[PDB]
Design a binder for this molecule. Sequence first.
Ligand SMILES: [Ca+2]
Ligand SMILES: [Ca+2]
Ligand SMILES: [Ca+2]
Ligand SMILES: [Ca+2]
Ligand SMILES: [Cl-]
Ligand SMILES: [Cl-]
Lengths: 69, 227
Amino acid sequence: MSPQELQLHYFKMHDYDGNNLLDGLELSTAITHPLMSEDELINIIDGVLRDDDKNNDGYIDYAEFAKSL
Amino acid sequence: PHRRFEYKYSFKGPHLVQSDGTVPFWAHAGNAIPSSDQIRVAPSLKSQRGSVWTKTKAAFENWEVEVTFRVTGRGRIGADGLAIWYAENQGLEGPVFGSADLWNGVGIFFDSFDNDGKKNNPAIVIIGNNGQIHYDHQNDGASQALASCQRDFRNKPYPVRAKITYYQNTLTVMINNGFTPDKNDYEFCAKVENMIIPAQGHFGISAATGGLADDHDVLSFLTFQLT
Ligand SMILES: [Ca+2]
Ligand SMILES: [Ca+2]
Ligand SMILES: [Ca+2]
Ligand SMILES: [Ca+2]
Ligand SMILES: [Cl-]
Ligand SMILES: [Cl-]
């Protein structure tokens, strides 16, 4: 399985509502899967959206995802 | 108008609760029970209160929230109902559908129980407040209501959906009444032009029961910034 497919598989695995978009609540469950601190969870997620959410819609689509990789 | 999803002011399933029983980024209180795919904000037991509020304040000029919920009960009559909040302060516990009275900002009240006997319930009532109004329980807020509609949101085959938009100073409430599977069949409910609300607030949701009691469930609370 090529890098390109392991990535697709990861994207689809955390797309819990099946809309082909990753939102911060979905990323949080990926990250969190004692509990980690919410504040650090907020930094990570905020960092991912700052870096990859090119159109600033609060989602990372597949193109934004593939570009981050 | 552009929509930005705001994860930090939102919750939903199918992994809604964390393993310690908390909802990420929200605080819950009273008898609210979070589970993996919904929060039972107040179960169908006597005299219950529960609430769920964002831990931090949002600072959005304009926003839209979509709240998907069920209110379910044996009777053609139920109580007390469910409130959606945008307010300066977290109103975690209190007598207003399970949350604090004398709030500063807006409550959208889904009021199942006809307290003043006017045969006009279930109703949805928008009530602005400035820190000083005591909510008028006995009259279903009738004298304090900026606007209202009649809409039976109880015991529907699909989840009811409230889309609440604050855009260019107007607060609109649209309701999908849950009669069919079409999650976008919204109908107008109410509107308030020139609404002033704090520039920073917590979003919240709460519910309560009395001698009559429905299960009040929120499947999802989804918040968008508009620009
Ligand atoms: Ca998704
Ligand atoms: Ca995006
Ligand atoms: Ca009432
Ligand atoms: Ca009434
Ligand atoms: Cl989730
Ligand atoms: Cl009652």
